[PDB]
């Protein structure tokens, strides 16, 4: 079984990748699809919304990872969802190394540019398995 | 059909892209795959030409015959039979611009590909400007 790997984000360059996996995949019936979103505390101001913030995050992880999951369900993929907590580059890096490929959207918004974004450098160097980029 | 078209070197990553074609590919009837391989431009020292003019020439167009060969029968004793696109000029270029025909491109990242580099991160230049989606194997 091939297992595949999709780093989800709210972006539409992650929308064209989900499209694309079904396209190159969907009709493989020996692979399965991951789908892997990551949960990303100093000042008053921060200390103070920590449990609106945690709440908000949980929220949108459900939302996000539901969204994903409609989207293949409905075309004839049941995926896996994997929802992690942690820096969310390290994370989706770290749970790579148990698939045959990562995918990943690649645009100005995704996750994989905010400022505090970890492997910006590096990520396709430390990646452990090969890497699916789609614009 | 869905295009594959693999950026073929003289590497052991290239080597390891292609398995992983296979791989991951190999069972499917829909997919057609096209190999590249783009032969460099001529530069020369002046040492070099006068020591070996004739030789350096023929020498460089037998690398593209034995590195299309050697992929050639790796993928058609497995039975794919792949379409072989030769070209001159400059790799990068090259590459990218015959890629917009294409479903997927497919690299393996080494220092010595016809990047001459490793590919470190998503940000990229090349991966930036590909025209479709990129495929990495390192």
Known sequence: MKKLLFAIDDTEACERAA??????FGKD???????????????????????EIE???????????????TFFTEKGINPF?????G????MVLEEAKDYNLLIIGSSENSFL???????????????????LIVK
């Open 19 to 24: 499209q694309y996996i079904l396209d190159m």
């Open 29 to 51: 019936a020996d692979c399965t699809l991951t789908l892997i979103h990551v949960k990303p505390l100093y000042g008053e101001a921060v200390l103070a919304a920590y449990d």
């Open 55 to 69: 709440m908000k995050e949980e929220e949108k992880a459900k939302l996000l990872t539901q969204k994903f999951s």
């Open 81 to 85: 969802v994997v929802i992690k907590e």
């Open 87 to 90: 820096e969310p580059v390290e």
């Open 113 to 131: 540019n905010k400022i505090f974004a970890s492997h910006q450098d590096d990520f396709i160097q430390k990646a452990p398995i090969p890497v």
